[PDB]
Structures are given as C-alpha cells and as structure tokens.
Design a protein around this motif. Sequence first.
Motif, PDB file in Angstrom:
ATOM      1  N   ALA A   1       0.849  -1.187   0.000  1.00  0.00           N
ATOM      2  CA  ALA A   1       0.000   0.000   0.000  1.00  0.00           C
ATOM      3  C   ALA A   1       0.891   1.246   0.000  1.00  0.00           C
ATOM      4  O   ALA A   1       0.585   2.250  -0.634  1.00  0.00           O
ATOM      5  N   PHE A   2       2.033   1.210   0.686  1.00  0.00           N
ATOM      6  CA  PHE A   2       2.948   2.357   0.758  1.00  0.00           C
ATOM      7  C   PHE A   2       3.280   2.904  -0.608  1.00  0.00           C
ATOM      8  O   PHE A   2       3.221   4.119  -0.833  1.00  0.00           O
ATOM      9  N   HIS A   3       3.560   2.025  -1.562  1.00  0.00           N
ATOM     10  CA  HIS A   3       4.035   2.469  -2.866  1.00  0.00           C
ATOM     11  C   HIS A   3       2.914   3.168  -3.642  1.00  0.00           C
ATOM     12  O   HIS A   3       3.177   4.035  -4.474  1.00  0.00           O
ATOM     13  N   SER A   4       1.683   2.768  -3.359  1.00  0.00           N
ATOM     14  CA  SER A   4       0.477   3.345  -3.986  1.00  0.00           C
ATOM     15  C   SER A   4       0.021   4.668  -3.321  1.00  0.00           C
ATOM     16  O   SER A   4      -0.509   5.541  -3.975  1.00  0.00           O
ATOM     17  N   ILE A   5       0.129   4.723  -2.010  1.00  0.00           N
ATOM     18  CA  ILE A   5      -0.524   5.735  -1.185  1.00  0.00           C
ATOM     19  C   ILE A   5       0.399   6.908  -0.804  1.00  0.00           C
ATOM     20  O   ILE A   5       0.043   8.072  -0.947  1.00  0.00           O
ATOM     21  N   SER A   6       1.598   6.562  -0.368  1.00  0.00           N
ATOM     22  CA  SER A   6       2.524   7.590   0.192  1.00  0.00           C
ATOM     23  C   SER A   6       3.713   7.896  -0.717  1.00  0.00           C
ATOM     24  O   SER A   6       4.148   9.038  -0.829  1.00  0.00           O
ATOM     25  N   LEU A   7       4.272   6.856  -1.358  1.00  0.00           N
ATOM     26  CA  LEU A   7       5.433   7.061  -2.196  1.00  0.00           C
ATOM     27  C   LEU A   7       5.272   8.138  -3.279  1.00  0.00           C
ATOM     28  O   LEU A   7       6.211   8.848  -3.532  1.00  0.00           O
ATOM     29  N   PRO A   8       4.071   8.287  -3.886  1.00  0.00           N
ATOM     30  CA  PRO A   8       3.989   9.313  -4.917  1.00  0.00           C
ATOM     31  C   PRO A   8       4.311  10.701  -4.351  1.00  0.00           C
ATOM     32  O   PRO A   8       4.902  11.531  -5.042  1.00  0.00           O
ATOM     33  N   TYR A   9       3.950  10.979  -3.121  1.00  0.00           N
ATOM     34  CA  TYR A   9       4.291  12.277  -2.552  1.00  0.00           C
ATOM     35  C   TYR A   9       5.811  12.365  -2.196  1.00  0.00           C
ATOM     36  O   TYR A   9       6.453  13.396  -2.416  1.00  0.00           O
ATOM     37  N   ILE A  10       6.367  11.282  -1.603  1.00  0.00           N
ATOM     38  CA  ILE A  10       7.805  11.266  -1.324  1.00  0.00           C
ATOM     39  C   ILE A  10       8.592  11.596  -2.596  1.00  0.00           C
ATOM     40  O   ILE A  10       9.534  12.354  -2.573  1.00  0.00           O
ATOM     41  N   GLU A  11       8.187  10.962  -3.695  1.00  0.00           N
ATOM     42  CA  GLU A  11       8.809  11.204  -5.011  1.00  0.00           C
ATOM     43  C   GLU A  11       8.793  12.710  -5.353  1.00  0.00           C
ATOM     44  O   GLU A  11       9.821  13.307  -5.701  1.00  0.00           O
ATOM     45  N   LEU A  12       7.619  13.307  -5.291  1.00  0.00           N
ATOM     46  CA  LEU A  12       7.476  14.749  -5.566  1.00  0.00           C
ATOM     47  C   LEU A  12       8.295  15.613  -4.634  1.00  0.00           C
ATOM     48  O   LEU A  12       9.012  16.502  -5.053  1.00  0.00           O
ATOM     49  N   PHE A  13       8.200  15.331  -3.354  1.00  0.00           N
ATOM     50  CA  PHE A  13       8.962  16.052  -2.322  1.00  0.00           C
ATOM     51  C   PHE A  13      10.452  16.020  -2.645  1.00  0.00           C
ATOM     52  O   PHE A  13      11.135  17.057  -2.567  1.00  0.00           O
TER      53      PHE A  13
ATOM     54  N   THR B   1      12.029  15.666  -5.504  1.00  0.00           N
ATOM     55  CA  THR B   1      12.390  16.519  -6.641  1.00  0.00           C
ATOM     56  C   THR B   1      12.471  17.992  -6.279  1.00  0.00           C
ATOM     57  O   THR B   1      13.148  18.756  -6.972  1.00  0.00           O
ATOM     58  N   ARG B   2      11.861  18.363  -5.172  1.00  0.00           N
ATOM     59  CA  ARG B   2      11.689  19.762  -4.749  1.00  0.00           C
ATOM     60  C   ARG B   2      12.459  20.160  -3.501  1.00  0.00           C
ATOM     61  O   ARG B   2      12.409  21.234  -3.092  1.00  0.00           O
ATOM     62  N   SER B   3      13.183  19.202  -2.937  1.00  0.00           N
ATOM     63  CA  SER B   3      13.901  19.386  -1.670  1.00  0.00           C
ATOM     64  C   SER B   3      15.384  19.109  -1.850  1.00  0.00           C
ATOM     65  O   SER B   3      15.761  18.306  -2.599  1.00  0.00           O
ATOM     66  N   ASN B   4      16.202  19.806  -1.105  1.00  0.00           N
ATOM     67  CA  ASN B   4      17.637  19.547  -1.110  1.00  0.00           C
ATOM     68  C   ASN B   4      18.020  18.354  -0.254  1.00  0.00           C
ATOM     69  O   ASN B   4      19.119  17.841  -0.409  1.00  0.00           O
ATOM     70  N   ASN B   5      17.137  17.909   0.638  1.00  0.00           N
ATOM     71  CA  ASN B   5      17.423  16.813   1.566  1.00  0.00           C
ATOM     72  C   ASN B   5      16.285  15.769   1.494  1.00  0.00           C
ATOM     73  O   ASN B   5      15.221  15.934   2.064  1.00  0.00           O
ATOM     74  N   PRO B   6      16.482  14.739   0.700  1.00  0.00           N
ATOM     75  CA  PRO B   6      15.356  13.865   0.344  1.00  0.00           C
ATOM     76  C   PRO B   6      15.033  12.907   1.462  1.00  0.00           C
ATOM     77  O   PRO B   6      15.916  12.512   2.223  1.00  0.00           O
ATOM     78  N   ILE B   7      13.781  12.494   1.474  1.00  0.00           N
ATOM     79  CA  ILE B   7      13.310  11.407   2.357  1.00  0.00           C
ATOM     80  C   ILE B   7      13.570  10.105   1.625  1.00  0.00           C
ATOM     81  O   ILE B   7      13.186   9.934   0.480  1.00  0.00           O
ATOM     82  N   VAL B   8      14.267   9.181   2.287  1.00  0.00           N
ATOM     83  CA  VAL B   8      14.624   7.925   1.678  1.00  0.00           C
ATOM     84  C   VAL B   8      13.887   6.763   2.334  1.00  0.00           C
ATOM     85  O   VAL B   8      13.283   6.908   3.376  1.00  0.00           O
ATOM     86  N   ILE B   9      13.964   5.585   1.706  1.00  0.00           N
ATOM     87  CA  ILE B   9      13.435   4.338   2.289  1.00  0.00           C
ATOM     88  C   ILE B   9      14.610   3.618   2.936  1.00  0.00           C
ATOM     89  O   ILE B   9      15.607   3.361   2.298  1.00  0.00           O
ATOM     90  N   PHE B  10      14.504   3.334   4.226  1.00  0.00           N
ATOM     91  CA  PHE B  10      15.622   2.737   4.951  1.00  0.00           C
ATOM     92  C   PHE B  10      16.200   1.511   4.235  1.00  0.00           C
ATOM     93  O   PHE B  10      17.405   1.386   4.046  1.00  0.00           O
ATOM     94  N   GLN B  11      15.321   0.618   3.800  1.00  0.00           N
ATOM     95  CA  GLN B  11      15.744  -0.683   3.268  1.00  0.00           C
ATOM     96  C   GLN B  11      16.485  -0.540   1.943  1.00  0.00           C
ATOM     97  O   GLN B  11      17.250  -1.418   1.577  1.00  0.00           O
ATOM     98  N   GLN B  12      16.284   0.561   1.241  1.00  0.00           N
ATOM     99  CA  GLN B  12      17.001   0.873   0.004  1.00  0.00           C
ATOM    100  C   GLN B  12      18.347   1.573   0.263  1.00  0.00           C
ATOM    101  O   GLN B  12      19.079   1.873  -0.689  1.00  0.00           O
ATOM    102  N   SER B  13      18.640   1.955   1.519  1.00  0.00           N
ATOM    103  CA  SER B  13      19.565   3.030   1.816  1.00  0.00           C
ATOM    104  C   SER B  13      20.722   2.668   2.733  1.00  0.00           C
ATOM    105  O   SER B  13      21.307   3.597   3.352  1.00  0.00           O
ATOM    106  N   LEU B  14      20.998   1.385   2.932  1.00  0.00           N
ATOM    107  CA  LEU B  14      22.082   1.045   3.874  1.00  0.00           C
ATOM    108  C   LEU B  14      23.407   1.721   3.503  1.00  0.00           C
ATOM    109  O   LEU B  14      24.086   2.303   4.336  1.00  0.00           O
ATOM    110  N   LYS B  15      23.766   1.685   2.244  1.00  0.00           N
ATOM    111  CA  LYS B  15      25.032   2.255   1.779  1.00  0.00           C
ATOM    112  C   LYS B  15      25.060   3.760   1.935  1.00  0.00           C
ATOM    113  O   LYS B  15      26.003   4.342   2.459  1.00  0.00           O
TER     114      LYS B  15
END
Lengths: 224, 224
Positions: free
Chosen positions: B186-198, B200-214
């Motif tokens: 549900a996350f990818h359908s409901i919330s991710l579209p806004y994270i994506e937009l945010f 593109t418009r922010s200097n400090n992006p919100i990431v997904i922990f599980q994608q982001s270990l490195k």
Amino acid sequence: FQGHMLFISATNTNAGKTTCARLLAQYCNACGVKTILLKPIETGVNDAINHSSDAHLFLQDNRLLDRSLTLKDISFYRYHKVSAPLIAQQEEDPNAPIDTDNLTQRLHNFTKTYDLVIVEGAGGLCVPITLEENMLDFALKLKAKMLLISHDNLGLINDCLLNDFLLKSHQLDYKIAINLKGNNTAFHSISLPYIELFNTRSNNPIVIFQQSLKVLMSFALKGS
Amino acid sequence: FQGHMLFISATNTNAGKTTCARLLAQYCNACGVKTILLKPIETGVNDAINHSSDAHLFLQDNRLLDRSLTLKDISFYRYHKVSAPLIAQQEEDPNAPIDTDNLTQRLHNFTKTYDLVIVEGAGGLCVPITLEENMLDFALKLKAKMLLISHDNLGLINDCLLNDFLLKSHQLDYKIAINLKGNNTAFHSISLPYIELFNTRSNNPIVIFQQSLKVLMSFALKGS
Ligand SMILES: Nc1nc2c(ncn2[C@@H]2O[C@H](COP(=O)(O)OP(=O)(O)O)[C@@H](O)[C@H]2O)c(=O)[nH]1
Ligand SMILES: Nc1nc2c(ncn2[C@@H]2O[C@H](COP(=O)(O)OP(=O)(O)O)[C@@H](O)[C@H]2O)c(=O)[nH]1
Ligand SMILES: NCCCCCCCC(=O)O
Ligand SMILES: NCCCCCCCC(=O)O
Ligand SMILES: [Mg+2]
Ligand SMILES: [Mg+2]
Ligand SMILES: [Mg+2]
Ligand SMILES: [Mg+2]
C-alpha cells in the motif's frame, strides 16, 4: 464582524477531528452560537455507496439549521483514493488542481449567515493540498483560528509538541486539545503528568477537549 | 577524527528505531566500519524479568565485538514506567534528574574505540528527558548526526514533514528514512507518490531505509 472561522486539524488522521468538531458545534448551537460544519476537502470516499463520510455526518447536523443544504454545499473536492489530497487529485482529476482561492471564498461566504464556521481539514497540518500548499497554508489563507486535535495514546507528547513548534512559528491563534476517549485512564497516569508540567511553563496550554467545550467556544469567538 | 556519532530518533515510538539501528550497525560492521549500538535512556523495562529490551538486543549484537560489555555499559537510565523519560524519572527516581552532560561524556568515550557510535533515543524528537531538554536537545549536545526513522503507514507524510520542519530549524545534519515493513505494498500506492514529488523539490530527500544502507553509512561517516 462577520462570523468567526475555526479550522480543525489534528496530530494525524483518526485523531478525532470529526468527532470533536461535531461536539463543539452541538455545544455552540445549544448556546445560541449558530454554527456550521464544513469539510471542504475529503479523501477516501465513495458517495455512491456510502453516506457516513465526514461531510455526510456534518450535513446531518447542519440540516438542523438549514434543510436546503446538500453535500455539495459543504464539501467541494472529494476523492476515492485513501491518501493525501494532492495525490488523490493528481490521480483522479489531473486537470483540476485544488483551488484554495475558490475554497476561501466559499468558506467565507458562510460567515454571512453563521456566527461560527468550523472547517475540518484532512489529516494533519503538513498534508499536501497542492504542490505549493498544505493544510496549515490553507488555514493561514483563511485567516482562521486553529484547533488541533490530538490523540490520547502513548506518543501524544511528541506529536503535540511537534505541532506546537510548527504552529508557534506561524502567524495564527491556535489551541491544541486532546481527544480523551471513553475508557482511557492510562492517559492520566502516562501522559497527563507531562501536560500538567508543560502548562505551568507555557503561555498557551494543551487542554483536554472533553473538559474544554466552554473554553474552546470562547477561543473560537474571541476578538476580530 | 575520533569515531563518528549517529543519533537515531523517529516519528514516534514503535516506528523502527531499534530494528533499523541493528540493521545499519550489522551492515557497517560487515563493511569493516566498527560500530557500537547504545541505548542511553530506556523506559518501560523490567530487567529482572525480561531480556528483550532495546538495550538487551543491542548488547547481543555488541558482544560480537567485545565480550566484556554488559547492559550497564550501554544503557544508563532505565525505568519501569512506559512513559516519557522525564515522567518516569520523576516518579521512580525523583532525586536523580537525567544528567545529559554525563551521558555526553559516556557516549563520546566510545568514539575512542569505534568507527561509529549509534545512539538510539526514546520515542520521538520532542520527548522530554529533563525539564529543559528533549531528545533533539540531547542530540544537539552530542553534536551527532541524526537519522529519523518514520513509520510506513498512512499519515507518514504529515509525520515526516513535521519532523523535517523541526530539524531544518536546528543546526544539525539529518536524514529521514522510512522503515518499510515486509508485506506493505500500500505504501508504494498511497505515500510514495508524494515522497517522489517532495524529493524533486527538496535539497534533503526522504529515503526508504531498506534501500539506503550504503547511503546511510556514507551519511553517518561523512566529514568531521
Ligand atoms: N471508542 C471511541 N472511538 C472514538 C472516540 N473519538 C473518536 N472515535 C473514533 O475514532 C475514529 C476516528 O475519529 P474521527 O473523529 O473521524 O477522526 P478524524 O479522522 O481525525 O476526523 C472514528 O471511528 C470515531 O468513531 C471515542 O471517544 N471513543
Ligand atoms: N512485521 C514487521 N515488524 C517490524 C518491522 N520493523 C519493525 N517491526 C516491529 O515493530 C515493533 C517496533 O519496532 P522497533 O524497532 O522496536 O521500534 P522503536 O520502538 O522505534 O525502536 C517491533 O515489534 C518490531 O519487531 C517489519 O519490517 N515487519
Ligand atoms: N517503549 C517505551 C516507549 C516510551 C515512549 C514515550 C513517548 C512519550 C510521548 O511522546 O508521548
Ligand atoms: N480518512 C482519509 C484520510 C486521509 C489522510 C491523508 C494522510 C496523508 C499523510 O499525512 O500521510
Ligand atoms: Mg477520518
Ligand atoms: Mg475527519
Ligand atoms: Mg520501542
Ligand atoms: Mg527502540
């Protein structure tokens, strides 16, 4: 003045905006303060099949003052997707970004015929409506007072204080009120001791909604 | 420099601080970045009867690097009450307010022997420790970088953005990362579209922990 306007936001969705809005409007009406409930933007709805949305509950209450009201008079942007309004709009109605200038006019028009216009938002303060505006921005454009409803569970301190920080950083009058549900006495043991301390140290105290109908009516109507 | 220090906070309790801290420390250790996990303050615990507190889980992981570690080496203020630390301390230990100067010294001492010191807070950023200091104040005193873990459910936009506002208003380097649980699409359908937009418009992006270990290891170790 024309009627006062009170925006109702929350720590998040499901905190009690609709419940508390209805209780406050009922109290105000009983006190002779003629009060309408508006839900300008609502997501997660299917009006063909379901008549229990926030706007529908508001409409039931409102028709006690005006039989002619219909859903479209009190709610203007309505979407199926259970999401932030910006996302719902981009998916379901890509050619019609939510127009907050229009909404401002429609909401203010009710100040002609009501002593108090209560405007429920959707979700919390930072929920996006357009690319440029969130719920707090909308409340600011409305020049409304703000009532922020908190949940009553563990974690409310953090959530209330995050909102306090955001609100105190902007130019509006606001109150934070906890929606203390029936059967919850853990609240008084777990969270209330901090609310107590905070209130001795703050110029703008956090109150319990259920204790505060009179105070919140006074707040909503005070001044210009 | 001596070892880097990363504070881990969250949108609220139960968001995934402990889970994500352990995953990050495991990844760092596997990469040759010698990393300790600390839980300086913990509420809601009974160590006579239960060995599954955050500090206990940290201790299990830490003993892979140092057999001599014990609970008291990595957690210093521990309370039974399931509440904010200030309240727990006032009720259970009224004569000993939490001493963040002391904690700062104890936590920094580990920078001698570790490349990275991970410090989990309790609850979210605005949780009170003393009358004058919350978790964010503590992180500021520590001069740590901040990793703020969000939940993955409806409402995360508001919660992440409230924290973004508070963090961007203070003098620290921070990342917000969503703890995306298994089986949630549900996350990818409901919330991710806004994270994506945010993003593109922010200097400090919100990431997904599980994608982001490195990325988060790089963040934690960068600069002074
Ligand atoms: N049991 C119980 N449920 C409540 C209370 N206040 C609100 N609710 C329920 O909590 C849910 C969310 O409330 P609502 O007012 O719609 O919150 P909103 O989404 O912030 O507008 C609804 O199912 C309400 O019926 C209460 O005092 N007791
Ligand atoms: N099913 C599931 N549970 C999770 C996941 N991440 C965290 N949890 C659970 O969520 C609860 C809270 O997590 P924790 O890391 O302790 O959060 P904290 O209180 O913020 O430190 C624990 O019961 C975890 O086991 C996940 O990906 N899947
Ligand atoms: N698992 C112990 C968690 C303690 C959470 C404290 C939250 C305080 C609040 O922000 O209301
Ligand atoms: N009941 C419909 C609620 C829509 C809530 C939107 C929340 C967006 C967020 O802050 O993540
Ligand atoms: Mg709702
Ligand atoms: Mg509602
Ligand atoms: Mg926890
Ligand atoms: Mg934890």
